Structures are given as structure tokens and as C-alpha cells.
RNA sequence: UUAAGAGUUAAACCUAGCCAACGAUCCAUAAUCGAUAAUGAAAGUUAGAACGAUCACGUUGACUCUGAAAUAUAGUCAAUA
RNA sequence: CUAGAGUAGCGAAACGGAUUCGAUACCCGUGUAGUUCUAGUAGUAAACUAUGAAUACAAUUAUUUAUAAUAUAUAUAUAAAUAAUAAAUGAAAAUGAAAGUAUUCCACCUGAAGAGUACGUUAGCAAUAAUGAAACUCAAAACAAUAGACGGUUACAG
């Protein structure tokens, strides 16, 4: 049946985050944190990767 | 005994009630989202100390 | 709803056994008509609209916003160390509804057992439902109106 | 779903069509018994 | 007149021109002193084969038509059986349409992820260009690019709260001083309370 | 107990009076032939030598019948008439023979209750 | 075919139905009923001898004629005596 | 119970030692099956609260138990459970928020014995499980409580 299959496939997609998070929002939020910190690079990449792994 | 047992809710009262209920739902969702982003930020601070490599 | 009326009858008996002066019943048209018939017949001291918390001091208008929290508050009468409303029972039960014509109602009021219903007693009130109006059995006989024999109260 | 059929038949049929079930699957008595698990090869 | 009964079609399409109609009648059971419903199933003739299972139909007495058929459908009182077949047929196409549509949407979203941050923000902030500015263009500005959805939600929420609170305050004020409410009732054209609330709610 | 259970057949058991003389086939009495005359011992506390006889009735059933009265002249192949009524202290004997009917004579020198013992005035 | 409907009976073609745990099918038992009789406070229960109503049969089975109406207490054939 | 593994302890049966008038028993020793695991069959227990499920209602107290407060203190409110009860019910024992007041639906009962037996049927590899008679006999049979008697029954005194 198409509905069950599409729902399960969307669950199995990469970069899918649990606890009601979205990857687009998460990336924009992290960039906003860094820009705000400036207004007041590999280490930030590692922080991002740790977050995405914990929220995967 | 003459009074009607129930008086129907007028369309204006219904509209105001729907406004308030939609607001309640939206506010709860927004507060969940705000605390969610806050917890994400508090993890983003301590993410320095997490080994990934 | 005969189930709710049966619940009210049993609740009235329970409240008379412990001698509470004021109690509440569900707020419905049938419940209000039944309580009004009891009040006019002298079985209740007072009948008020109110909430789940108590009778209303001033008029409170009933709407869908507060319909679930409405109650009807009834005052019970006692005299000479005896409750005025001792027994209150259904005749027409939910699983056996008894609809009588006017002639059988007269027979019942005259001492004849009709459909296993014991006849009317000297100080008893039998209520009848006709066209969604509760009313005294003798009144239904006077108006020549067939109906559902609903409950006894003594 | 039986309530939905009694209430809104159009939405009922659309719903059971979209969920992968037919009307028989809804209206018929279904004890999820050993015979079902054999006929439909659940395991 | 002829015997007439009202019943539910409980079995159709299994016999040619014959349906099964379930009828109920009021009887008195003296053994239990109760008015009961006595149920029966009739084989009923259906010329035109118009009835379906679940229809409420009136059956009428006729001449004997077979060994067991003595009644015919005289009228379709309620036609839920035909409606069920209509919706059965319609849902087949209705569902499949959006089933294909949303599968297309899923595949497009997958491709968008396939052809797919902090580096872009670093380039935009530091260069403020070495052939990278237009390359970014193909994908005051640092902020608007970093625009979360929660902010719009908060703006809409404050708008909603303000609307509700203002409506209630205005309503209470008008109901308090009852001269200006009359002024407004003749300006805009116990029922007066509902009409006043209508006018105040359209007011904002 | 519920109304639907009473509709389905629940109710007081019938006060059905079972026949105490099934071998007569709802007849006031039956003719029979005595197969033998027996002398049985009653149950305790009663003590006596009770006069009885096996009798085959015209309907074929063989029963044990008490012989009432002080003295009897029943003997094998005698024709007797058998009515209901058990002998309480003899288990298995559920019938009485009629004195003064058939080949069984009425009680000799009976004064009281003559009709119960086949005696003429 | 019938005055006349109907798998009622006969013939042909189809469809795959129909009844049934609220009791089918099968088996046993029984003529049925009342403003009739019995009983009981009554609901009811019992009987169905008498009075009346209806059915079925006239030693057993099938068929036929006549007839508006008969498998007739008729006729034919068979069985029993 | 059927297969396949496992089997240290326990332990039907069996074999012995005691005890006894006798031992076929209690006790002691070896100890098979079983108890264990895997895949099944079977669907019975005092499978018990000897108390079917749901709903509405009825006077108290004390404990906890879990939330919600308010500033350890409010001997804090609102729920559930437990314990002792009022009323009510009940043959009583007693139940006590049900064994009360009511309503709805289902299951079941109609003296003891024969008998949960026989026969039949269905299911199961079997053991069996389910369904479930009648004749015969009797004026019995049972429950709660009462007062004794008795106990290889307790404690206290003299
Ligand atoms: Mg036809
Ligand atoms: Mg004598
Ligand atoms: Mg034809
Ligand atoms: Mg044919
Ligand atoms: Mg049968
Ligand atoms: Mg006969
Ligand atoms: Mg009869
Ligand atoms: Mg007669
Ligand atoms: Mg005669
Ligand atoms: Mg004849
Ligand atoms: Mg003769
Ligand atoms: Mg003949
Ligand atoms: Mg093995
Ligand atoms: Mg072992
Ligand atoms: Mg051992
Ligand atoms: Mg012993
Ligand atoms: Mg041993
Ligand atoms: Mg199993
Ligand atoms: Mg057993
Ligand atoms: Mg059992
Ligand atoms: Mg009891
Ligand atoms: Mg057995």
C-alpha cells in the first residue's frame, strides 16, 4: 500500500533527526548561534557532527 | 420552568472560542519548540568536549 | 433516558436514608420535569438550578460552555422523624418499557394489577410520560391521554 | 472505522482505500487467531 | 389493501431479481411481559435490480412469484446501499491520484537532498567575492539567510493574543457604558449583546 | 435471572408430580398373574413377616405387590388385581393387591373397613 | 397443463443459490380448536369424552372416469382376510 | 504425552533396611520417570476474593500511596488502596463502598444418592478434555450459629 511504504521510507531517509528536530532548522540555528557570537572552523564542524550524531 | 434548558452558542461566541483554542494549541506548540531550541543550544555549548574523531 | 431516571430514583432513596437536606441530580429536561412534579406534589422542599458545586444564588444562564457542570438541586422533606420521600422506583424499566392506554391507567388507579404493576396506593404518586411531558397519572386520566407509566414515589 | 462508515461513508471508503484495507477487512469479525496467522503467513 | 412492510435489504446480488429483506414487527411476549421486536427475512422480487444491501425499502404483497417469493420492492425509502457503491467506486481513483502526487513529492525531496552552512557564513562575513559570491548567489543578508521558523510563529502568536485580548476588552467596555453601545448600534445599522459582539469582532 | 434469560427459558421448576405406579400405565388397576408368593422382612425398626407376591401384569410388567389383610389365599398362578400404593417398610414393593377381586378372597371375618378388604356385610 | 399464480407437475436453458445454535435437517409423539369442560385469586395449566367448529379416513396403496367440486365408502389394478 | 538435547540436586515407580501382631505406610538407603532447555500436543486446578462485567449513588475515621499547591509548617487539598465502622443487607458468620441502594448484559442453580457415572458425539499421539442421562432407593441432605463433650489442644496459676 503506498501510504505505509512512503511513511516508512521517509522515516528511513538520511539526516532524519529524532525528538522533533529538522536538519534545515538545526543547521540554520547553529549558524545563527555562531553569527550572534561574532556580533557580540573545523572545531565548529566537529560540534555540528556531534550534534547530528546525537540527534540522528 | 419557562426558561430554555440550553441556549445555543452564537456564531460570534463560536468564532471567539475557536480563536482562543487555536491560540492555546499554537502557544503550546511554540513553547515546546522554544524549549527544544534551548536544549539544542545547551548541547551546542558542551559539544566541544564530545569526541567524534 | 430511563437509566438516568433510575439513577435519580436510587440516589433520592440513598439521600433520604441518611437524611441530607439538599442533594443534586443531573440537569436534563426529563430530570427537571420529574423534579418539578415531585416539588408540586409536596415531596420536595425546593428545586433550584445550579452547578456541580451548589445551587445558584442568582440566575446563571446555561450554554454549551457550562452544560457539563450544571446540576438540579433538590431539597428533601422530613417530618415526625420520617422522610416524606421514602421510596422511589421505576415502573417502566429500560429493558421493559410499559406503555398503557387511558383505560388501563384508570384500572391501575382503581386497584387493578395491570401488566404486573401493583395498583396505586393511598399516598403514592405514579408519574406518566406523554409527548415528552411528565405528569401525574390521575392528571393523564383527566386529560384522556395514553402514555408510558414511568415511576412510583411514596 | 465501522463508526466512520456509519457516520461519513465517503470519507470511510476513501480512508480504507488509502490505508490498504477493504470493506470486508473492517466489517467482518476478526479474531487474530491461529487460522489467520496460517492463511496469511504472518510468521 | 395489500400487506406492506418496511425493512432493510440484508442480502442482494446473489440471486437473479431477488433480494433478502429483514423486517421487524412489534409483538407482546406475555411470558416476560414485554413488547418485543419479532424479526424475519423475506425473499423479495426486485425488477430492475435497483436495491443494494443496507437500503431501507418498502415491500408489498404480490402474487406468488416462486416457491418462496411473495413480495416485491415497492419503494426505496433510503438508499445507503447505492451510496456505498458510489463511494467505493470513487475512492479508487481519488486515492490513487494523490498517492502518485505525494510519491512524486517524496522523490523530488529526495533528489533535493541528493544534490544538496558554516563555511558559507564565514565567506560572506570575512569577504565583507573571489568568484565565490555569485556561486553563493546561485544558492543584512547573513541574518535573512539565517531565518528560523520559530520567529514567524512568535509574531503570529503575539498577533493572536493581541486580537483576543483587544476584542474582550472592547466588548467589556461597550457593555459597561451602555449609551455608546447604542450609539454604535445605530452607527453600524438581550439580542443586542450578541449583535454588539458581532460588530466588535468585525471591527478588528 | 435476567429478562432475556427468562425469555430464553429460565423459570421456576415445574411442581411435576411423578407417577408412583409407572407399571400400571396410568390405569386404576391391572389384572395380573402371581408368579410367586414371598415373605419379606421389613426395614428396621419394624419387625414382621410381610406377605407379598411377584405379579406379571397384562401389560407384561412384573411388579412386587403387598397382600393386605390378616390372612390371604394367594398362590402361584392366582389371578389378582393390582393397584397403586407402596408398602412403606418393604423396599421395592410399590403396589397393592386388591382383596375381594380375582382369585384373592376378601379378609375372613372382617368387621371394620370391610370395603378396604373385600368383605361383605 | 390449469378457470387460475407458483420448480406444483412435465421439458429445456441458465445463474449458485436456499435453510440452520432465536435450532435447520432428522427422529419420535399427537387429530385441531371454542363464546366447551376442569382448575386457580389471576396469569395461566389441563382435557379435546359430551355441545359446537375444522380437518382427515371409511380394510391397505396407486391410478382413472364422471363431475363445478372426488385419487369418491364409485370404478380399475394389486395387497390382506 | 510426542521428538531432540541435558540431567548437579530433588524424586513417583522399583529394589533393599527398619518399625509393626501384621507394613502392603509413615522413617532410612540406592534411585528410573519427572523436575531443566528447544519445537509441539493437551486446555484442566481449592484456575479462590469459593464473590462475572459495566454504570449512578450512599455516613465516618485512620493510615499509607500518588499528584497538585501554599509558606519542615499549612496536623495542607484532590484521588486510589488498605484497616475499623455507621446505615443498609443478611439464615447468620459477616459484607461495607459491595454481600448496600439502583440500572443493563452475560454465565449458572433447582433434594440426597446413582454421577460428573454410562452411552453417544467432538477433539487429542495417548492420558484424557468437553458435552452429559435415565432407571433404581430414600425422607433425607446441607449451611450458619448455640451449648456441651472430647482433643496424642495452648497459656497461666496454685
Ligand atoms: Mg419464477
Ligand atoms: Mg383401617
Ligand atoms: Mg412455471
Ligand atoms: Mg425441469
Ligand atoms: Mg430440531
Ligand atoms: Mg394417532
Ligand atoms: Mg394437546
Ligand atoms: Mg368432541
Ligand atoms: Mg363420541
Ligand atoms: Mg377417502
Ligand atoms: Mg372394519
Ligand atoms: Mg384409502
Ligand atoms: Mg524427551
Ligand atoms: Mg534428572
Ligand atoms: Mg533422595
Ligand atoms: Mg496409616
Ligand atoms: Mg523412599
Ligand atoms: Mg496451545
Ligand atoms: Mg479432569
Ligand atoms: Mg472446572
Ligand atoms: Mg446471600
Ligand atoms: Mg469425561
Describe it.
This is part of a larger assembly, with two copies of chain A, one copy of chain B (53 residues), one copy of chain C (154 residues), one copy of chain E (204 residues) and one copy of chain F (121 residues). Chain B has one helix spanning 11-46. Chain B is mainly alpha-helical and 53 residues long. Chain C has helices spanning 2-18, 29-40, 102-109, 137-142, and strands at residues 22-26, 44-51, 70-76, 78-79, 82-83, 88-90, 99-100, 125-130, 133-136, 147-153. In chain C, strands 6, 7, 8, 9 and 10 form a five-stranded antiparallel β-sheet that branches. In chain C, strands 1-3-2 form a three-stranded antiparallel β-sheet, with helices on one face. A two-stranded antiparallel sheet of chain C has the order 4-5. The longest helix of chain C has 17 residues, at 2-18. Chain C is globular and about 45 Å long. Chain E contains seven helices and five strands, in the order βββββααααααα. The complex binds magnesium ion (MG) (22 copies). The site of one magnesium ion has 2 residues of chain E, from loops. Chain C binds two RNA strands through residues 2-4, 6-15, 17-18, 20, 23, 26, 89-90, 93-95, 113, 116.
Give keywords.
part of a larger assembly; 6 chains; B: 53 residues; mainly alpha; rod-shaped; E: 204 residues; alpha+beta; 5-stranded mixed barrel; 5 strands; 25% strand; binds magnesium ion; RNA-binding; NA-bd_OB-fold (chain E)
Sketch the topology of chain A as an H/E string, one letter per element: HHH
Tell the overall outline of chain E.
flat
Shape of chain A: elongated
Please, how many helices of chain E?
7
Summarize the structure.
By secondary structure, chain B is mainly alpha-helical.
What order do the helices and strands come in, and which of them pair?
This is part of a larger assembly, with 2 copies of chain A, 1 copy of chain B (53 residues), 1 copy of chain C (154 residues), 1 copy of chain E (204 residues) and 1 copy of chain F (121 residues).
Chain A: H1 2-11, H2 23-39, H3 42-55
Chain C: H1 2-18, E1 22-26, H2 29-40, E2 44-51, E3 70-76, E4 78-79, E5 82-83, E6 88-90, E7 99-100, H3 102-109, E8 125-130, E9 133-136, H4 137-142, E10 147-153
Antiparallel strand pairs in C: 1-3, 2-3, 4-5, 6-10, 7-10, 8-9, 8-10
Chain E: E1 4-15, E2 18-29, E3 34-45, E4 56-61, E5 71-78, H1 80-115, H2 118-126, H3 132-137, H4 142-145, H5 150-176, H6 178-187, H7 191-203
One magnesium ion is lined by residues 65-66 of chain E.
The structure holds 2 RNA strands.
Family (chain C): Belongs to the universal ribosomal protein uS8 family.
Subcellular location (chain C): Mitochondrion
Keywords (chain C): Mitochondrion, Ribonucleoprotein, Ribosomal protein
